[PDB]
Amino acid sequence: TEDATDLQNEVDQELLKDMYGKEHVNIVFIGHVDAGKSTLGGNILFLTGMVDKRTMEKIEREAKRAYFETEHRRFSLLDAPGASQADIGVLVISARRGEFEAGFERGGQTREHAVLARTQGINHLVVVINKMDEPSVQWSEERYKECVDKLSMFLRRVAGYNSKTDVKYMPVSAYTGQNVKDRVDSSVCPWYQGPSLLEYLDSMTHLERKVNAPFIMPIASKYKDLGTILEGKIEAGSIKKNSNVLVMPINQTLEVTAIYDEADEEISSSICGDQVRLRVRGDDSDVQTGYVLTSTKNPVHATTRFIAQIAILELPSILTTGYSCVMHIHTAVEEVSFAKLLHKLDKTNRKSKKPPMFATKGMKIIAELETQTPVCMERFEDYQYMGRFTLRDQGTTVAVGKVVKILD
Numbered sequence: 001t002e003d004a005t006d007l008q009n010e011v012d013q014e015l016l017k018d019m020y021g022k023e024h025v026n027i028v029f030i031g032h033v034d035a036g037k038s039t040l041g042g043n044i045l046f047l048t049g050m051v052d053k054r055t056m057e058k059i060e061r062e063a064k065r066a067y068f069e070t071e072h073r074r075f076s077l078l079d080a081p082g083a084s085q086a087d088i089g090v091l092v093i094s095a096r097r098g099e100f101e102a103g104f105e106r107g108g109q110t111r112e113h114a115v116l117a118r119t120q121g122i123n124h125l126v127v128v129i130n131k132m133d134e135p136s137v138q139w140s141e142e143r144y145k146e147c148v149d150k151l152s153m154f155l156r157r158v159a160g161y162n163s164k165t166d167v168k169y170m171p172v173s174a175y176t177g178q179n180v181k182d183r184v185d186s187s188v189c190p191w192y193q194g195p196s197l198l199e200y201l202d203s204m205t206h207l208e209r210k211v212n213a214p215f216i217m218p219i220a221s222k223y224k225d226l227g228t229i230l231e232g233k234i235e236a237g238s239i240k241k242n243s244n245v246l247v248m249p250i251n252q253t254l255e256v257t258a259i260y261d262e263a264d265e266e267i268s269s270s271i272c273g274d275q276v277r278l279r280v281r282g283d284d285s286d287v288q289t290g291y292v293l294t295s296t297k298n299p300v301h302a303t304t305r306f307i308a309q310i311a312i313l314e315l316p317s318i319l320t321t322g323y324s325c326v327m328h329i330h331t332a333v334e335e336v337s338f339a340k341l342l343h344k345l346d347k348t349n350r351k352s353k354k355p356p357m358f359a360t361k362g363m364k365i366i367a368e369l370e371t372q373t374p375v376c377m378e379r380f381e382d383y384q385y386m387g388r389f390t391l392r393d394q395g396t397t398v399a400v401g402k403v404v405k406i407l408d
């Protein structure tokens with residue numbers, strides 16, 4: 001009834017590189033006159049190894065396509081006023097006395113900023129309470145609570161943000177870097193419990209473009225309860241309740257009726273990133289794990305022929321085409337066969353001028369694969385986990401790869 005590992009057999013040797021790039025995210029930074037935007041930005045580029053001290057200092061004085069990286073993502077900074085939409089919107093608010101307060105008055109532009117965000121499609125606003133080090137504020141839990149509560153009422157009032165479930169507040173010092181890359185030390189701020197800014201940014205689940213994409217949730221387990229329970233990780237989009245999903249590749253319709261979190265509570269909705277357990281009405285006689293629950297308008301793709309970069313780990317090593325094993329792309333489990341060894345690879349992913357007649361261990365290649373049955377997938381590029389597979393020679397492992405192109 002269930003799936004042990006969602007090709008989490010991808011463990012062993014960190015060669016997961018060049019072929020499994022980091023997640024491309026689009027972040028924008030919003031804030032007042034001297035809120036700290038430029039310093040915050042610069043310090044992140046430096047603290048995160050993108051730039052040197054001089055460059056840092058250069059950038060910051062001249063602000064008066066860049067990008068940074070965390071463990072699992074690459075963030076591309078966008079201007080203030082497809083890859084045009086922000087995934088994340090960071091409002092930078094100064095915690096200094098006089099500056100903070102200035103914002104919420106005739107002169108100040110904070111209400112404008114909340115509306116700007118809203119217009120830009122930011123429904124999960126990240127609010128950074130900057131300058132917690134500045135003498136007028138020295139990491140006082142009271143100053144922090146003062147700012148956060150004013151912002152709570154304010155943002156709900158002028159732009160509808162519900163601070164309990166929409167806005168994430170965070171204290172930082174853009175100048176000293178405290179709570180930017182690394183959490184603030186207890187000796188400096190005994191009270192803060194959460195993560196640093198980049199920690200949150202690296203793990204944070206609500207990415208606008210992805211939340212707004214079509215729904216995709218590979219079925220990881222089918223089992224009974226008050227009826228059938230399809231369940232897995234939502235990989236894109238969002239799911240409501242008493243709303244119809246499509247089952248691919250079979251193209252059969254169904255209706256969600258309950259959503260249960262990892263603590264089995266009947267919620268009304270979840271988004272991408274969440275690990276949920278659904279329940280549905282409809283003929284699920286042909287439904288099985290591996291298949292993908294998706295939007296009825298732009299459903300996930302399914303094909304039988306596609307292209308893909310691969311890397312052999314330890315197979316007996318030989319012959320082009322043919323070779324049949326067991327692919328795993330997200331929970332599907334499917335007999336796949338080589339069908340046109342097109343290019344080889346090496347060191348600095350070049351390509352290949354002499355299409356091999358076969359492959360071997362320690363040889364990464366690209367080739368047209370084939371399945372008798374169609375399997376749901378997408379380009380890693382577009383939906384990483386929907387294009388991340390591992391091959392398996394009848395028991396043992398063999399290779400691992402990503403899909404690059406869908407062939408009709």
Ligand SMILES: Nc1nc2c(ncn2[C@@H]2O[C@H](COP(=O)(O)OP(=O)(O)O)[C@@H](O)[C@H]2O)c(=O)[nH]1
Nearest residue numbers: 032033034035036037038039131134173174175
């Ligand atoms: N005390 C202190 N000063 C800061 C901090 N962050 C920014 N500032 C100062 O506040 C001013 C804001 O300018 P900037 O950092 O460029 O913010 P921007 O004008 O929005 O780009 C600068 O003079 C910074 O030195 C901080 O965390 N602590």
